[PDB]
Every structure is written in C-alpha cells, then in structure tokens.
Design a protein around this motif. Structure first.
Motif, PDB file in Angstrom:
ATOM      1  N   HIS A   1      13.779  12.948 -11.691  1.00 30.90           N
ATOM      2  CA  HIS A   1      14.014  11.602 -11.200  1.00 30.90           C
ATOM      3  C   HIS A   1      13.151  11.302  -9.988  1.00 30.90           C
ATOM      4  CE1 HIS A   1      16.941  10.267 -13.931  1.00 30.90           C
ATOM      5  NE2 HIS A   1      17.906  11.089 -13.563  1.00 30.90           N
ATOM      6  N   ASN A   2      12.266  10.326 -10.127  1.00 31.46           N
ATOM      7  CA  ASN A   2      11.203  10.180  -9.153  1.00 31.46           C
ATOM      8  C   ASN A   2      11.697   9.429  -7.923  1.00 31.46           C
ATOM      9  OD1 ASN A   2      11.277   7.408  -9.985  1.00 31.46           O
ATOM     10  ND2 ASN A   2       9.044   7.268  -9.915  1.00 31.46           N
ATOM     11  N   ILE A   3      10.776   9.187  -6.991  1.00 30.36           N
ATOM     12  CA  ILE A   3      11.091   8.416  -5.795  1.00 30.36           C
ATOM     13  C   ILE A   3      11.505   6.994  -6.132  1.00 30.36           C
ATOM     14  CG2 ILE A   3       8.589   8.112  -5.533  1.00 30.36           C
ATOM     15  CD1 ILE A   3      11.281   8.028  -2.767  1.00 30.36           C
TER      16      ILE A   3
ATOM     17  N   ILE B   1      18.302   2.620  -7.974  1.00 32.62           N
ATOM     18  CA  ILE B   1      19.718   2.929  -8.074  1.00 32.62           C
ATOM     19  C   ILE B   1      20.398   2.917  -6.713  1.00 32.62           C
ATOM     20  CG2 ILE B   1      19.958   5.400  -7.835  1.00 32.62           C
ATOM     21  CD1 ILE B   1      21.346   5.393 -10.512  1.00 32.62           C
ATOM     22  N   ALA B   2      19.642   2.913  -5.621  1.00 29.46           N
ATOM     23  CA  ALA B   2      20.239   2.482  -4.368  1.00 29.46           C
ATOM     24  C   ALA B   2      20.498   0.988  -4.403  1.00 29.46           C
ATOM     25  CB  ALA B   2      19.340   2.839  -3.196  1.00 29.46           C
TER      26      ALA B   2
ATOM     27  N   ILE C   1      11.634  11.471  -0.909  1.00 32.87           N
ATOM     28  CA  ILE C   1      12.453  11.572  -2.110  1.00 32.87           C
ATOM     29  C   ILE C   1      13.892  11.938  -1.785  1.00 32.87           C
ATOM     30  CG2 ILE C   1      11.449  13.881  -2.401  1.00 32.87           C
ATOM     31  CD1 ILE C   1      12.869  11.560  -5.140  1.00 32.87           C
TER      32      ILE C   1
ATOM     33  N   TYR D   1      12.949  21.304  -5.749  1.00 29.68           N
ATOM     34  CA  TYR D   1      13.062  21.020  -4.319  1.00 29.68           C
ATOM     35  C   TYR D   1      13.864  22.064  -3.556  1.00 29.68           C
ATOM     36  CZ  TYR D   1      11.840  16.431  -6.160  1.00 29.68           C
ATOM     37  OH  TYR D   1      11.248  15.395  -6.840  1.00 29.68           O
TER      38      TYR D   1
ATOM     39  N   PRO E   1       0.806  -1.248   0.000  1.00 27.93           N
ATOM     40  CA  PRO E   1       0.000   0.000   0.000  1.00 27.93           C
ATOM     41  C   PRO E   1       0.827   1.280   0.000  1.00 27.93           C
ATOM     42  CG  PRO E   1      -0.595  -1.491   1.830  1.00 27.93           C
ATOM     43  CD  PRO E   1       0.145  -2.285   0.808  1.00 27.93           C
ATOM     44  N   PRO E   2       2.072   1.294   0.510  1.00 27.39           N
ATOM     45  CA  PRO E   2       2.980   2.337   0.022  1.00 27.39           C
ATOM     46  C   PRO E   2       3.349   2.120  -1.433  1.00 27.39           C
ATOM     47  CG  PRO E   2       3.636   1.744   2.187  1.00 27.39           C
ATOM     48  CD  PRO E   2       2.540   0.798   1.821  1.00 27.39           C
ATOM     49  N   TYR E   3       2.907   3.028  -2.303  1.00 27.13           N
ATOM     50  CA  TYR E   3       3.223   3.090  -3.729  1.00 27.13           C
ATOM     51  C   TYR E   3       2.737   1.880  -4.512  1.00 27.13           C
ATOM     52  CZ  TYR E   3       6.547   6.442  -1.814  1.00 27.13           C
ATOM     53  OH  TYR E   3       7.135   7.469  -1.117  1.00 27.13           O
TER      54      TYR E   3
ATOM     55  N   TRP F   1      15.506   6.628  -7.772  1.00 30.45           N
ATOM     56  CA  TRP F   1      16.577   6.581  -6.794  1.00 30.45           C
ATOM     57  C   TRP F   1      16.466   5.365  -5.896  1.00 30.45           C
ATOM     58  CZ3 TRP F   1      20.542   9.456  -7.727  1.00 30.45           C
ATOM     59  CH2 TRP F   1      20.382  10.670  -8.390  1.00 30.45           C
ATOM     60  N   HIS F   2      15.304   4.722  -5.852  1.00 32.19           N
ATOM     61  CA  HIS F   2      15.173   3.544  -5.012  1.00 32.19           C
ATOM     62  C   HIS F   2      15.721   2.298  -5.693  1.00 32.19           C
ATOM     63  CE1 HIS F   2      13.978   0.664  -2.200  1.00 32.19           C
ATOM     64  NE2 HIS F   2      12.750   0.432  -2.620  1.00 32.19           N
TER      65      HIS F   2
ATOM     66  N   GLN G   1       7.557  18.501  -9.190  1.00 30.16           N
ATOM     67  CA  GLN G   1       8.827  18.453  -9.901  1.00 30.16           C
ATOM     68  C   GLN G   1       8.638  17.424 -10.998  1.00 30.16           C
ATOM     69  OE1 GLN G   1       8.658  18.615  -6.609  1.00 30.16           O
ATOM     70  NE2 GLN G   1       9.836  20.460  -6.114  1.00 30.16           N
TER      71      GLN G   1
ATOM     72  N   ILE H   1      21.109   8.311   0.075  1.00 36.21           N
ATOM     73  CA  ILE H   1      21.559   6.935   0.193  1.00 36.21           C
ATOM     74  C   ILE H   1      21.906   6.334  -1.161  1.00 36.21           C
ATOM     75  CG2 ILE H   1      19.547   5.475  -0.013  1.00 36.21           C
ATOM     76  CD1 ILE H   1      20.268   4.322   2.677  1.00 36.21           C
ATOM     77  N   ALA H   2      21.523   6.972  -2.260  1.00 34.07           N
ATOM     78  CA  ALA H   2      22.190   6.656  -3.512  1.00 34.07           C
ATOM     79  C   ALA H   2      23.610   7.188  -3.492  1.00 34.07           C
ATOM     80  CB  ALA H   2      21.421   7.233  -4.689  1.00 34.07           C
TER      81      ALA H   2
ATOM     82  N   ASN I   1       9.645  11.688 -13.445  1.00 33.74           N
ATOM     83  CA  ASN I   1       8.348  12.060 -12.911  1.00 33.74           C
ATOM     84  C   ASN I   1       7.350  12.269 -14.045  1.00 33.74           C
ATOM     85  OD1 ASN I   1       7.994  12.562  -9.879  1.00 33.74           O
ATOM     86  ND2 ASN I   1      10.040  13.381 -10.273  1.00 33.74           N
TER      87      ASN I   1
ATOM     88  N   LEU J   1      25.895   5.312  -1.054  1.00 27.25           N
ATOM     89  CA  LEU J   1      26.372   4.068  -1.636  1.00 27.25           C
ATOM     90  C   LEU J   1      27.096   4.281  -2.947  1.00 27.25           C
ATOM     91  CD1 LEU J   1      23.384   1.692  -1.026  1.00 27.25           C
ATOM     92  CD2 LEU J   1      25.383   2.024   0.334  1.00 27.25           C
TER      93      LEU J   1
ATOM     94  N   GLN K   1       1.981   9.577   1.367  1.00 35.59           N
ATOM     95  CA  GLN K   1       2.669   8.515   2.091  1.00 35.59           C
ATOM     96  C   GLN K   1       3.467   9.215   3.174  1.00 35.59           C
ATOM     97  OE1 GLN K   1       2.428   8.530  -1.201  1.00 35.59           O
ATOM     98  NE2 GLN K   1       1.428   6.574  -1.661  1.00 35.59           N
TER      99      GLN K   1
ATOM    100  N   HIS L   1       3.325  16.823 -12.021  1.00 32.11           N
ATOM    101  CA  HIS L   1       4.031  16.645 -10.773  1.00 32.11           C
ATOM    102  C   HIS L   1       4.687  17.960 -10.387  1.00 32.11           C
ATOM    103  CE1 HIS L   1       7.173  14.942  -7.998  1.00 32.11           C
ATOM    104  NE2 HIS L   1       6.112  14.246  -7.631  1.00 32.11           N
TER     105      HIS L   1
ATOM    106  N   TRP M   1      16.237   8.696  -0.108  1.00 27.18           N
ATOM    107  CA  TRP M   1      16.814   7.781  -1.076  1.00 27.18           C
ATOM    108  C   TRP M   1      17.803   8.477  -1.990  1.00 27.18           C
ATOM    109  CZ3 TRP M   1      16.341   2.921  -0.068  1.00 27.18           C
ATOM    110  CH2 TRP M   1      15.216   2.456   0.607  1.00 27.18           C
TER     111      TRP M   1
END
Lengths: 725, 725
Positions: free
Chosen positions: A669-671, A677-678, B671, B631, A629-631, A674-675, A665, B677-678, A659, B681, B665, A663, B674
């Motif tokens: 580069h959306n949430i 690419i982590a 945003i 941002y 339910p998150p995203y 970067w998630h 922004q 933390i990109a 994005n 890392l 959320q 939006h 992450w």
C-alpha cells in the motif's frame, strides 16, 4: 326476554338512513343466515345475544336478503341518551370551539365509534364468555358474517336530503376527477376515521416535502449534465491519443482477456453525471432535508392533534383474541423461553436473505463469462449488461422472497403471542420491516461497501467460498452497479404496486361499460388496516434517504409514485373497501421510531456512499495534493493526467493503489493509498458531525409549537377563564 | 376594615407551634418595623394589605421583637376549610394510596406551600398593584423584610410532643453524626420541598453511579501500574546502552540546547501508567457508563415522579418582577433588536476567556526559558516543572475569572429581560454554564488538540502572533500536560469549594465552645436556590466524562468530593439556611439537556484524546505493521527498537514523522505518518459508531418503566376500578 322484531322489512330504496319509520340514523349492519344441530347451537348463541343489546337498549330491524344463502341482515340504531350515556364514558367533543362531554348543541362518524364501544363491551355470560370482539371471533367462526357501519351511498352517483360526504370525495378527492388538486384533509377525518386521516396527512406532508427534495434533485443532476467537457476524468480514457492503451488485468484467469479502457467511456460519461460535485451538495442537502422532514412533521404533529381531538387517555384496555388460562394471580417461565425461541426463529430466517444475496453475486460472476463472449446498437459492454441482469433478475427474486415472506409473517406472529390488540401489529412492524430492510437494501449494501474492495497482491484476493474466485471491481468506483440497481428496485417496485394495482381495476372499469343493502359486497378491510400501505412508503422512504448520495433522481421517482399513490389507494378506500369503524388514533406510532431509525442511519450511509463507493475522494486528493512538485509534475492543481498515473502496475495495470514493482516495498500500500483513505475517513467524520450538529441546531432553534397552536391553545385558555367563573 | 390584632404576645418558649391558644399550626412569619413621611406611606401600604388576608381569612398574631430595630413579627395560620378551599385549586394528594383533592383523612410542608399560593395571588388594587410577589419586591424595597415559613426547632438539641423532623436529619443525615450512612431521601422531600428532594436524589444517584465508575478507575490504573517492565516503550529511552543519545532539536533557537532523552524517563515512567492499554478499556467503559448514567437515572426518573406527586399541570402562570407597560394587545421589534444585542454582549465576553488561554500559553513559553537555566531531589525537568506552573498559576486565573463572572452574570441577566419567573434562571443556566464550559475545559482543549501539532519543515511552524515563535511538544504525545492540569483544575476546585467552605464553619464550630422567634437570623436562600450547587456538579460531571481518556482516577477524586459534598451543603441546608417554601418541581429541567449535551459530546472527545493526544496509535501501528520485513527488520510483531527508528532526521532528530534528508521528497510527510493518521482517524470512526450504537442499543432494550412502576401504576389502576363503581 327482550328480543328483536326478528323480521321487519320495507326497502323501497337503497338510499334509506332509517329502518322504516323516519328520523332514525343507522349505525351498524350485521348479517347471519339461520334459514336451516350445530346451526341450532349457533342460533341460540346469536338469539340470546340480542337480549344483551336491548337490555342496554337498541333498535333492531331484521331485513332479509332477497337472493343468496347469506340471509337476513340486522340493523341497529342508538337512541339519543343511549348515544349520550356512553358519550360520558368516552370523552368526545361536540360543537369554533369544542369542549369535553357537555357542549352547546350530529355526525355518523362519532355515532359509529361509540356504538362499537357499546358493542365491544358486552357479555355472553357462560365462562366470562364472548364479547362483540368475541363475536368478531364468531364473525370469524360462528353464525355472524360481517358487522360493519353502513356506507353512505353508491360511489358513482349521488334520497335527496342526504349529506353527500362520499360524493365530495369522489369529485374532489378520488381518481377519475380532480387528480392534481389539493387535499380535503379535514373531511377525510370526519368521514373515515383518524388513523386514516393521519395516514393521508402524513402522505400529504410527504409529497410536499419530497417536492422540495426533487427540485434540488434536478438542480444537482443538470449540474452533472450541463458539463459537456467533464473537465478531465472520463475524458482521457478514450482520447484520440489512444489513452485506453492501459491493458488492465483480467478477472477469474480462465477466459477474460487483458482488456482496455476503450470500453469504459460509454459508462463513464454516465458516471460524471452522477458523482462530480453536485452529489456532495445533494447528499449534504438530503441529511438536512430528512432532518427538516421529521421536525416540520413534528410541527405537523400537535396541530392535527390539536385541530382534531386525538385524545390519549381513553378506556381501551385489551382485546386479546387468543386463548389463555390463568391460575397464577400475578407457564410464564416457559413463555419467556417460548419468547426467545420464537423471536430467534425469524433471526434464523433473516439470515436466508443475506445468504440469498450471496446467491445473487455468485450468479453475477458466472454469467459474466458467457456475456464477455458474444461481442454496437446499444453499447452494452460485458459489464453494464451484466449489471442490468444483476438487477432485473434479482429484483424478481426480491419480489418472490417478499411475497412468500408475507404469508409466513402472519403465520408466525399469531404463533408469537398475538396479545394486546394493538401490540400485535406493533410486534408485526418490527418483525416485518426488518425483513424488508434486508430484502431490499442488502443487495445495495453489498454493491456499495463489500463489492469493490478486498483485492490481492498479484490480484490474489481472499477467496471466499473456500477456493472460489473473489469479486472484482471496475475503475470508476463501481457506482453504476448501485445506481442502475437502485432505480431498478425502486422503479420496478413502483410499477409492481401501481401498474399491477391501478390498471387491474382500470381494465375492470372499461370492461363494465364496453365489451338494497348491497354495500356488504365490498371487500372487508383486514385488521391490519394501513399496515402494508405504511410499509410501502417506509421502504420508499428508505431508498430516497439511505442511498441518495448516488442517483439524485430518487425524489423524482418518489413524487410520480406518490401523487399517484395518494390517489390510487384513496380510490380503493372509497370504491373498493367496506366502511370501517372510525377508530381514533395517535401519531403513526409503530413507524415513528422507524422513520427516526432511518434518518439517524441515513446520515451514516450517505457519507459512506460518497467516500467508500464514489470515486471522487481519489479524484479530489489527486487534484489537490498530487499535481504539485511533491509527487507530481504540474504547475498548479489539475487532473491533467490522472488515470495513467494512479493505477498500480503488475509484472499489467490494475485498479488499486499498491506499490509498483521495483519498489523496496513493492506491491504494498503506497504513500498515495493511505493518503486517500485518510481523506476518505476524514470526510466521514466532518460530514457526520456537521449534520448531527445541524440535526441538533435545527431542532433546538425552531420549535414544535411553531406559531399558531402555541397561541390557539392559549386562545383556548383565554376563553375557559371566560367560562369558568 | 377587618384588621389584625396588631399586638399579641406571650412567648413562653421558642418551641411553640401556636400563637398563644393551642392546637393551631403556624405557617409563615413576616417582619416589619414601623416604630417610627415615607414610613407613613409604607405603613398604610402594609396596614391596608392586612385586610386582603383576613377577607380571605387568616389569623394574625403580631409578636414584637425584644432587642433590635427589626421590630414586630407577624404570624399566620390557615384554618381547615381555608386550607381546604385552595386544596381544590391546586391538586394535592392526602392520605399506601393517595388520591386527588378528596381523600380519606396533616403535614406543615403541604400547609406552607398552599398558603404561599394563598399569599402570592393577592392584590393591592391601585393600578393592578402588588401581589405578595410584589410584596416580595416590597420585601426587597418597602416595609416588610422577611416572609418565610417557621423552621421546626433549634438544629442542635431537640416542647416534647413536637415531631422531630429536623432532629432526624441532624442525627441521620447531617454532618457530625452518621456521615457514611445511606439516604433518608423520602423524608427530605416531606420536610424541605421537591427541587431539594430531586437534588439529593440526583446526587444520591450520582455517587452510586460514580462508585461503579471508580472501581474500574483503579482496575484500569493498577493495570497500568502493576507492569514494572513497561514492555518496550519508555524503557529504551534510558537503557544502559545510552539510548538517550538522540540529540533532539531545541525550541525557540535562543537558549534551548540540543537536549537528550536522558531527561524523559522520570516523566515517561509515569506515562506508561496512563496510556498503555487500560485507557482503551476505560474510555470505552466511560462512554458506556455515561450512557448507563442517563438511562438508569431516567429509570430513577418517573418513580420519584410516581412515588411523590410532582404534578405538572398546576396553575403557576407568571410572576415577572420587572416593570413593563402595555398598549399592543397582541417595542417588541426594538425588544427583539434588544435581544440580539444583549445575547451577543456575552458572545463578546466568552471570547475573552479563549483569548485568556492565549495569555496562559504565551506565559508557558516565556517562563520555560528561565526554567531551563537553573539546573535532583525531585526530578522536576525543564518540562514538568513548567507544566506544574502552567496549571497551578492558570488555575488561579480560572478561579479569578470565574468569581468575577458571577457578579456580571446577574448584572446582565436582569438586563437581559428577566421575565417569567422560572425562565429567568432558565436563561441563566445557558448563559452561565457556557462560560464555565470555556473557563474550565478550554485550557485542556488547547493541551489536547491545539498544542502538540503544527510544526514545520526545519521545524519552522506557522508563527502565531505574527512572527512570534510557535508552540512545541514532547515525544510522548504531551499527555502529561493534560493530566497534570486535569487533576489540578479538578482537585483544586474540590479544595476551593469544600476546604474553603467546610473548614470555614468548622473553625466557627470550635471557636464557639473553646477560646424566641430567633430563626429569622439564618441566611435567606437566594431566588437561585440550587443553581450554583447544580453548576458545581455539572462542571464536576464534565471532568469525569469529557477528559477521562487520560487520568482514570477522576471518579476517585469525584467520589471523595461527592460523599463530602452531599453532606456539606445538606448541613448548610439545615444549620445555616432559612426555611424555604417547599416548592414542587419536575425533573432538573434546565440541566437535563446539559447532561445530555455533555454525554453526546463526551463520546466525541474521548476518542479524540485517545487518538489525537495519546501516543499509542503510533505505538500500535509500529507494533503491528512496521516490525515486519515490509518497513522493519524483526521476525514478528514487537516494538524492539521503536524510538530510534520512528523520529525524523534533520541535517538532529525531532518528534514528527516527516521524511529524512536524502529522500527524493525529503522532509515531507512519509509513508508512516499517513499510515498512523489513517488508523488515528479510523479509531475515531469505529469507537464513535460502536458507542453511539450501544447508546441506541441500551436505550432501546431496557425500558424506563423498568419493573415495578409499570406495575405500581397499574396496581393503582387495579384499585380505582375497585373505587369507580
């Protein structure tokens, strides 16, 4: 004074080991014409040279040729003490248990080496003038034409009392009998040499080590092949819900249309077989396997070093065929400025190939446009048909650039101070291979890393070549353009060096039947003996280790190369090549840091092909963290609906994770981006540090003495205390 | 048969090198009482032993003691051929240019070693009974008490004709004269031994290598110190705009208050001096410096191996003081089950220390509450005052746990099969150091990585210890709790091993003035000669390399240790310790993979202290990517307003980067989080792969033969061809 008979002859049969007398071995043959003022000068060059042999003491039969301009041979034999007097100079082991220089109670291999040492340290006494290696330059320049040891017998048929050491290798080791048979490895050493023996012992290790790497190659691949569902990915892109109604942004804005995901399933069915989950298991195995490769061969090292002599401290000083004066008594300042210009001359030539792959990709964009026009029997697609001709055409250009590099390789390394007879090829291995490293893999280095990235805001990427259009990728990670081009460069080179090289005398074998000191007729081996034959495997060792995160069938192509490759040159070592001097050698030497330099580089790039190229870290993030339910709107972790809800949106839908419009922004580069690419850069870190620890942990645990040679060198020391007294 | 004089005496002076005659060297001294049935058995044990010496042939003066129960000495001397007959057993080099076993035309150091080899290979002939090393166990058990070489002279004052080889080392190398003077290094070898000589040559390398590491230690630190502005961070937290009106969430929800950023500037002023930008330059230098450390010492290797002998292949077989029967002729199955239980007994003891640091942190939370209550002269803060007592109390517990480990270290490694005289300490170095690795650094391993992370949704983190309250951090990255505790453990141990160890005989030096075969009175060196002295530096080598991303003054604390440390034990090597046998040794051996195991680990953790601990990757991301109209509301890249606009919000403001309430959320990873933390890392990956390439590039470029020893071994081979003939 003290000259040869100059004429002695009674052939009788080509299977003679003595000149005419009996009970005499034959060590070397030499040839020269002199039947007809330059020939007068070369005659007294040759004629006075013979006194230096018999003042050291040899026996010299000069049998004349019967047919051609290449006239009278010379044979030679070392007597027993003449053999023995240089068996104390060098340190040779005679016979269980062998000892240095003085033993219980031979072989022509050890006979032929020391007489070459007896040959090579000789003088012409003009200005400290030519030795036999200078007469090797007189073999290159003056009267002599070929000095070589006499080969045993004719290669096809079997004198009766002769040992048949060739004939064993035809019936047990050559091609047309006994292909899929094990190795006679110790006898290869006893007849040919040691660098030849360490070559096949390396290959004979390399095939059995590849065999372990290939049964996991099909355990990985069938795991990607048994799944007919394919779970979710590559199944909703052509579902009978349309699902390919996505209308992706076209390329180059000139003639490409707003295309659809109907045209992906012929490719993406063949993508789930390549990146699903087994290649995680496969590439973590390959880094373990290449770690196990070097260590278990280092255990294969120091046993052949023990079961044979391979003694290090012998008296090879220097040859240096080049010409150089001396006044300094230790211009060397100008020679060092000569060094930094000549080594940078190839640093100017390596940059052509990385410029040449730029020539390849600029063809790939231009020929794509005419390929998109003419649009069933084979579902080629404006992409994979472009990806084929991106490979097979470029593979020719790799082959063209490689062959023209070979001539200008030797044309410059003799210009790059070819001193110190073994340092010459040791300078060659670092300057030839680094071309082959960038000739072969740099096309795949683009397709892995540089290709799929760097798109833009309305898809306006950084225009390389000034304002020329940038490069675009395919949803799916653009992995197929690697693994098609991977098997083209590997599978093509396998054909180009075997089928062009084993069927070339195979038609000569069938054209002979249907439709004597003769053994000088065979081809002389070059001074670079096994160099291209080592280079052929190290490049083959590259593709099986650098780029095996995709295409896990690469050991299976390497096996069917090698079990043929270990037999084809072994056949040409016997049936084609003149008998070389059995020179003793150490470990591989010039290539041993290169296989170490590949393995510590293969662990880096196998992570980078998995993360940065293979579209599964975006899958595994979406499966694990965007179905909640998150995203996300699903109950638990699944990819039930991933492709419609991961692409970007344009005011059209393109591949990247920016994005959507509307939006705060937008088109940034959306949430999610970067998630991944982590977790992309996370996976590089854990998989490196595990395998670099397993590289440490395996090498520290299991030793290099293993179990027998740590005893058999001490079982040796158990008996010299029985013999010291 | 063939016994000693049993009584011979004429002291005259304690400066005698002969017994009574003249022109006789003295090699070893031995002692035993026998003035008074067990003593009868030990007498005939000792008395029959003397025949084995003189059947090999020695000279034995038995001078009696004059004072105590420790009665009559025994002196010994090897004659010339008796010296010479074992100079062919071993391979010793006599005198420019030295040669094996037979030379032109000595020294008591080489005299004392071979007589120990003449001593050690002897027999008592009962059941293949004791050798001198078994008499070393009779030194441990039976009649003899001390066998040792006679030291040169009294350490303070200077016979006149004696070489003063001690007296040079007092005036040029010991403490009270000539501290800050260079090294007499070659003479240390010629009088003491080789493992002693390789010790100070390692230390004498280590200080000059640390000196390079310390001038960048202040170039980094003053760069963090010269900036009085501090730019933005740590300046708006106490501006005269309030700015510390932020009302952070308290800890433990029992008595901590909703506190403010007024109480951070006394700490955070001393934080900008530690993580600003120079520690990026410093930690990238330290990985280069430790890479340069090992390689340039490997160039210091193979020259002292060349300028001294350090010959490898000598005839040290085995000693094995333990007792073990034999029937198998090669229970060893039960001994291997004995191995896996005894080595796992310490694997059960190492887990106490990582449980003991759990005992430290649970004190840190509980004592924080009473520290927050009683609240100017020194601005301590409920945090750094807690951080001091988190260190100085735990540093005692490290010192308590270390000292009690030492007794149970030797109490178990003799239980853990103490075979093969050098493998015993070689088994000790891997089992003692791994305690010290987790005794020292694991407190800092918590504070670096485990401490500052893992908070929760209303700040409800994972409750460790069941439902017990989790650990919380401080805005600023909680780096100060490392670098205060780093200099406490390093700076405290420096005092605890020097000021407790150099002022301990310094008060003995001043209490002597104000307020003979005597040289057996000195303390005997243990069999572990330089073991704790090596261990003292390797742990010191750990703090200067593992944790120097913070606290760049760690070389400066290491220098002022070492220039004292190289002199304090050198003083106690002369003025305190009995003269040991000058045993030849190789490289450091047991510690050489441990310094390699630190350097390849220091590159990993120096990235992890920069990224995961130091609050600058959140600064550099905000400076580069959140001050733009995406941002942010600034014109260009600045941190003009960072702390108010990076913290989270609670329906209060806490440290992490979760979503604010009123987000779709909300209280989830935003945003921005992450995005650091990109880049966190990311920075691990580039800084590892650069330094691991520079580790490759430096080691491949500059060689280990360097420039002189590649010539001076060939200038040697230039003259054996002048001498072979």
């Amino acid at each position: 004074d003290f000259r040869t008979p100059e004429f002695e002859e009674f052939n009788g049969k080509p299977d003679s080991l003595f000149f005419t007398d009996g009970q005499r071995r034959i060590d070397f043959i030499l040839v020269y014409e002199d039947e007809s003022g330059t020939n007068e000068k070369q005659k007294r060059k040759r004629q006075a040279y013979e006194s230096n042999l018999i003042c050291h003491g040899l026996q010299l039969e000069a049998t004349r040729s019967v047919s051609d301009d290449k006239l009278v041979f010379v044979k030679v034999h070392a007597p027993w003490e003449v053999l023995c007097t240089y068996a104390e100079i060098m340190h040779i082991k005679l016979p269980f248990e062998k000892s240095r220089m003085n033993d219980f109670y031979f072989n022509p291999a050890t006979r032929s080496r020391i007489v070459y040492f007896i040959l090579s340290r000789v003088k012409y006494q003009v200005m400290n003038n030519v030795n036999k290696f200078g007469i090797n330059r007189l073999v290159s320049s003056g009267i002599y034409k070929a000095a070589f040891p006499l080969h045993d017998c004719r290669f096809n048929y079997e004198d009766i009392s002769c040992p048949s050491e060739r004939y064993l290798l035809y019936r047990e080791w050559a091609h047309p009998r006994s292909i899929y048979k094990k190795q006679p490895l110790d006898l290869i050493r006893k007849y040919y040499g040691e660098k030849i023996g360490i070559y096949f012992a390396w290959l004979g290790y390399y095939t059995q080590m590849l065999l372990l790497a290939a049964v996991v190659g099909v355990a990985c691949f069938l795991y990607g092949y048994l799944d007919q569902d394919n779970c979710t990915w590559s199944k909703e892109v052509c579902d009978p819900d349309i699902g390919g109604q996505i209308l992706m942004c076209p390329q180059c804005d000139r003639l490409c249309p707003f295309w659809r995901l109907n045209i992906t399933c012929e490719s993406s069915k063949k993508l789930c077989i390549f990146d699903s989950f087994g290649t995680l298991i496969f590439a973590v195995f390959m880094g373990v396997w290449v770690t196990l490769f070097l260590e278990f061969w280092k255990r294969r090292q120091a046993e052949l070093e023990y079961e044979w002599d391979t003694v290090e401290l012998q008296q090879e000083e220097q040859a240096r065929p080049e010409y150089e004066a001396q006044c300094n008594h230790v211009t060397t300042c100008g020679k060092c400025i000569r060094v930094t210009l000549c080594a940078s001359a190839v640093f100017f030539w390596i940059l052509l190939i990385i410029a040449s792959v730029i020539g390849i990709i600029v063809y790939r964009l231009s020929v794509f446009i005419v390929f998109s026009t003419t649009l069933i029997q084979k579902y080629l697609t404006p992409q994979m048909a472009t990806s084929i001709t991106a490979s097979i055409i470029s593979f020719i250009i790799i082959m063209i650039l490689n062959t023209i590099y070979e001539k200008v390789a030797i044309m410059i390394t003799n210009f790059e101070l070819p001193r110190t007879q073994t340092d010459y090829e040791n300078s060659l291995t670092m300057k030839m291979f680094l071309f082959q490293f960038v000739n072969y893999y740099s096309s795949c280095f683009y397709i892995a890393f540089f290709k799929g990235k760097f798109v833009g805001y309305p898809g306006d990427p950084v225009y390389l070549l000034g304002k020329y259009r940038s490069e675009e990728c395919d949803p799916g990670g653009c992995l197929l353009e690697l693994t098609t081009q991977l098997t083209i460069i590997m599978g093509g080179k396998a054909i180009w060096n075997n089928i062009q090289e084993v069927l070339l005398p195979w038609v000569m074998n069938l054209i002979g039947r249907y439709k004597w000191e003769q053994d000088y007729h065979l081809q002389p081996m070059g001074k670079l003996g096994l160099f291209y034959e080592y280079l052929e495997m190290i490049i083959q060792f590259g593709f099986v280790t650098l780029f095996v995160a995709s295409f896990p069938l690469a050991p299976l192509l390497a096996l069917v190369n090698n079990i043929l490759e270990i037999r084809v040159d072994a056949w040409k070592l016997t049936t084609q090549f003149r008998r070389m001097v059995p020179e003793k050698a150490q470990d591989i030497g010039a290539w041993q840091p290169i296989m170490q330099g590949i393995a510590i580089l293969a662990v880096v790039t196998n992570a980078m092909i998995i993360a940065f190229t293979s579209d599964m870290i975006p899958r595994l993030v979406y499966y694990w963290s965007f179905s909640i339910p998150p995203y996300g709107d699903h109950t638990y972790y699944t990819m039930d609906g991933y492709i419609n809800n991961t692409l970007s949106v344009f005011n059209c839908r393109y591949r990247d994770f920016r994005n959507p419009p509307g939006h705060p922004q937008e088109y940034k580069h959306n949430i999610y981006y970067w998630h991944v690419i982590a977790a992309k850069l996370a996976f590089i870190i854990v998989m490196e540090h595990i395998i670099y620890s397993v590289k440490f942990f395996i090498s520290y645990a299991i030793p290099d003495v293993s179990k027998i040679t740590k005893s058999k060198i001490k079982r040796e020391k158990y008996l010299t205390q029985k013999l010291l007294h």
